[PDB]
Structures are given as structure tokens and as C-alpha cells.
Amino acid sequence: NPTYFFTFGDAYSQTGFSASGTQPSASNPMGNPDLGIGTTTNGPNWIGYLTTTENASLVLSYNLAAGGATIDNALVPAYPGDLASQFRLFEDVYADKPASAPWSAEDAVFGVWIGINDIGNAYYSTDAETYTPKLISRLESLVEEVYKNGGRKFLFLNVPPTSRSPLFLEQGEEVVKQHAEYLSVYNENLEGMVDDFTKKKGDVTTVLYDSWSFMTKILDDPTAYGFPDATCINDDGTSCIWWNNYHPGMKYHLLQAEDMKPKLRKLGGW
């Protein structure tokens, strides 16, 4: 009795899963590519860890996340595979519960980690208080498409402190601050939307995972987590928090998946 874990997001979540590649099964829960390929971590990412390491029962991962994605290119644009396009791929291939993914309300979990790129691209050019409600409203309307398909279990990750990635640190402390302040408003509005959606529907099980606070704890005390500092980069994915200037490594992702596990029990696969 599997949990069907459909995920949507950006490079913090990408694995290179193709809808025409090998599909998930009990012997191969990621489907494609192999566990530990296709990420920005040098190994598994949080989804691979949640599916194969932190799972309490069989989890099948259908990971539609794409590098560089924003929520909708009609708002903050970047790459063709925005969140809207990932929801369209879901609608095209899995929404109708095909034999390859015969999911139901009781066994499907929809995970969304989006906003890093919307904020990264719009923090200095838009007003957070008036603009981030538009981003969040568009996220909500995409979630509503899955709800209309019969989805009832949802996992939302807030935006982590990319303000303190080496990429942003190099732009100066006032840019880190401008970005961080915008990000905080986005995360507040995300929480409000998740709360409002949960209450309005009444029949959904939702988890808002505060990645921001978790990563912030590690950035503030890196050596307590086995990292020598909060700024070094190492593409082995484990010597430093950062695998490259803007993406954390597999060690961070494992620590996050481990932190997530207890909070995901109510979703069925953990």
C-alpha cells in the first residue's frame, strides 16, 4: 500500500525525473534516475531521503521539480518549467489516476517547495507586501487544481535563508537584508495561505515545514552539525553546507529530511 508522493519545486528539489522514464515501483521508488542522480547536492536530496531513508512504509516519488523554477512566468518569469508547467505535467500524466499511479485521497501526498527563485528575482524590484500575495494566490490556485483532482494531503516547505547563500553574501550585507526582509513577508503570507486553505476546505491534511528556521539554526551554529563554517562551498556535498554558491549539499538535505520525518507522520509515509 504505497504513498504516492508528487513533488513540485525548483533546483532544491530537482532530480531529473522524466514522466517517460522508468516509473516508480516498490523495487524502484524514485522511478528515474537512480537515487542520488540529478540533484544539486552531490547525492540524494530531501525527496530521495524522505522516499528511501526516512520512509515508514512504501513511498513512490514522482518528482516534477525543475531547476530555476518560479511559480508562474506570468508573474516572476525565469525558465519554461515553472511551477504552473509542473502542475500541467501532473494534469497531463497523473491527475487522472492511471494504472501506473492509481492514487487516491488517502494515499497521495503533494509536496511543494517554491519561492526561492521568485524572491531571488523580484526582491528589489517589487513591493513584498502587495506583490507576494499575488505569488501566493497563484500558488493557491495551482493547489486547487490538484484538490479538484481529489488530492487532500499537502506538504508545503517555506523558503530557506538563501539570503545567506554565498551567492547573496557576495552582493553585500544590505542586499542580504533586503532579500531576507522580502523573503520573510513571502513566508508569512505562505503560512497564512496554508492555514486559510486548510480551514476553508476542512477535509485536507496539511503540513507547513519551516525550512527557514531549520537551516537558520545550522547557519548560526554550523559546527554543532559537523560543518566547519556557514559559508564554505564543497561539491562533495558533505564538507560544507553549500554544494555550490546557491544550493546546499546532501548532508544538509539529509539533516532536513531527518528533521522533517516526525512532522510528516500525519501525511502517511513517515
How many folded domains does the chain comprise? 1
- 247 sits in which H/E element: strand 247-248
- Which region, left, alpha or beta, applies to residue 31 given φ > 0 means left and ψ of -120 to 50 means alpha? left
Question: Distance (Å, rounded) from C-alpha 195 to C-alpha 15?
Answer: 29
Question: Distance (Å, rounded) from C-alpha 136 to C-alpha 2?
Answer: 30
The helix/strand/coil state of 113 is: strand
Cβ-based neighbour number of residue 26 at 10 Å: 8
- Here the cell at position 3 is 504513498
Question: Distance (Å, rounded) from C-alpha 122 to C-alpha 74?
Answer: 13
Exposure on the CB side of residue 269, measured as CA atoms within 13 A: 30
Quick one: which of 23, 31, 21, 22 has its CA closest to 52? 31
Cβ-based neighbour number of residue 151 at 10 Å: 22
Exposure on the CB side of residue 80, measured as CA atoms within 13 A: 1
DSSP β-bridge partners for residue 111? 7, 155
Which CATH number covers residue 66?
A: 3.40.50.1110
Question: 73-98: b or e for each residue (b if 16 or more CB lie within 10 Å)?
Answer: bebbebeebbbbbbbbbbeebbbeee
Domain that holds residue 53: 3-267
Distance of CA 17 to the CA centre of its chain: 15
Question: Distance (Å, rounded) from C-alpha 63 to C-alpha 65?
Answer: 6
Question: Distance (Å, rounded) from C-alpha 198 to C-alpha 246?
Answer: 32
DSSP H helices in 170-220: 173-201, 211-220
Question: Distance (Å, rounded) from C-alpha 3 to C-alpha 24?
Answer: 11
Locate cell 484538490: which residue?
Answer: 147
Interior CA angle at 96 toward 92 and 97, to 5°?
120
Q: How far is CA 226 from CA 44, 238, 249, in A?
A: 18, 9, 13
- Here the cell at position 106 is 488517502
- Parallel, antiparallel, or unpaired: how do β-strands 247-248 and 205-209 relate? unpaired
The contacts of residue 116 (CB under 8 Å, 6+ apart) are: 10, 12, 159, 160, 162
**Radius of gyration for the alpha carbons in the chain, expressed in angstroms and rounded:** 17
What are residue 114's phi and psi, to 5 degrees? -140, 155
- Here the cell at position 2 is 504505497
The helix/strand/coil state of 28 is: strand
- Here the cell at position 253 is 538535505
Contact 267, 153 (CB under 8 A): yes
Query: How far does the chain reach from its first CA to its final CA, in angstroms?
Result: 13
Question: Distance (Å, rounded) from C-alpha 110 to C-alpha 196?
Answer: 17
Burial of 21 (0-12, 13-18, 19+ CB in 10 A): exposed
Name the strands in the sheet holding 3-9, side by side, starting at the edge strand that comes first in the sequence. 59-63, 3-9, 108-113, 153-157, 205-209
The helix/strand/coil state of 8 is: strand
